[PDB]
From Swiss-Prot:
Modifications the protein undergoes after translation, according to the UniProt entry: Contains a chromophore consisting of modified amino acid residues. Maturation of the chromophore requires nothing other than molecular oxygen.
Origin species: Aequorea victoria
Biotechnology and industry use: Green fluorescent protein has been engineered to produce a vast number of variously colored mutants, fusion proteins, and biosensors. Further generation of mutants led to more stable proteins (at 37 degrees Celsius for example) with brighter fluorescence and longer fluorescence lifetimes.
Nucleotidyltransferase as UniProt keyword: no
Gene behind the chain: GFP
Consequence recorded when altering N196S: In EBFP1.2; shifts the excitation and emission spectra to shorter wavelengths and increases quantum yields compared to BFP
Keywords: Chromophore, Luminescence, Photoprotein
Record-given protein name: Green fluorescent protein
Result, substituting Q67M: In Citrinine; leads to excitation and emission peaks of 516 and 529 nm, respectively
Keyword 4Fe-4S tagged: no
């Protein structure tokens, strides 16, 4: 049988992203729009800094900017926490530790508002070096592919996730961003608590040649795997 949560994602869904941020007192806001196609695990989003120049590098916000759009193949349909929490939604909390620099703490509420899937985020960053790789804008505008490891936290009626991003610094080096996350349902209804598995990510960053505001165009694909004889 197809669950309610699953059914909400059977076609293309419009997405709205909202972020209010404050990094070392540098305040900024971002809005994003686009759409998600969970059948293909496909996100197409464009973000605008509505407060002027973004005070951190766009790539450092990629992971923050809707895991309900991951492609869960049929055989893994019992392990899709994210869709099972819909439409009421879930809250994602992360801490992102930038090695030898500051940290971001984020809280994102992911829920439907009518037909639109909303990702509403508050981001707080502290302890950054004002001339470091983040506040000094020394990161390249590119992105690596990654696997992301998901485990149940049954005790907390949710999931925990940990992974590493390795941002490319303009000198050929690496700025590690260690991610730790918890996702919890907003509502009181049952959710699917998964066996251990992972999500496989690829991300491409680009620019709109007709856009004069500070912005990022993101194309991202996300597929679940790690659970698998018929052959």
């Amino acid at each position: 049988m197809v669950s309610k949560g699953e059914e909400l994602f059977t076609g293309v869904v419009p997405i709205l992203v909202e972020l209010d941020g404050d990094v070392n007192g540098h305040k900024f806001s971002v809005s994003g729009e686009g759409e998600g196609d969970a059948t293909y695990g496909k996100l197409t989003l464009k973000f605008i800094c509505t407060t002027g120049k973004l005070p951190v590098p766009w790539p450092t916000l990629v992971t923050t900017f809707v895991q309900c759009f991951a492609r869960y193949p049929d055989h893994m349909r019992q392990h899709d926490f994210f869709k099972s929490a819909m439409p009421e939604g879930y809250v994602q909390e992360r801490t992102i530790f930038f090695k030898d620099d500051g940290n971001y703490k984020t809280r994102a509420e992911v829920k439907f508002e009518g037909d639109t899937l909303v990702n509403r985020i508050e981001l707080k960053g502290i302890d950054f070096k004002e001339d470091g790789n983040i506040l000094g804008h020394k990161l390249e505008y590119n992105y690596n592919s990654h696997n992301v490891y998901i485990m149940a936290d049954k005790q907390k009626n949710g999931i925990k996730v940990n992974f590493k991003i390795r941002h490319n610094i303009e000198d050929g080096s690496v700025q590690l961003a260690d991610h730790y996350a918890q996702n919890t349902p907003i509502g009181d209804g049952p959710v699917l608590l998964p066996d251990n598995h992972y999500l496989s990510y690829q991300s491409a960053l680009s620019k709109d040649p007709n856009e004069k505001r500070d912005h990022m165009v993101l194309l991202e694909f996300v597929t679940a795997a790690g659970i698998t004889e018929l052959y």
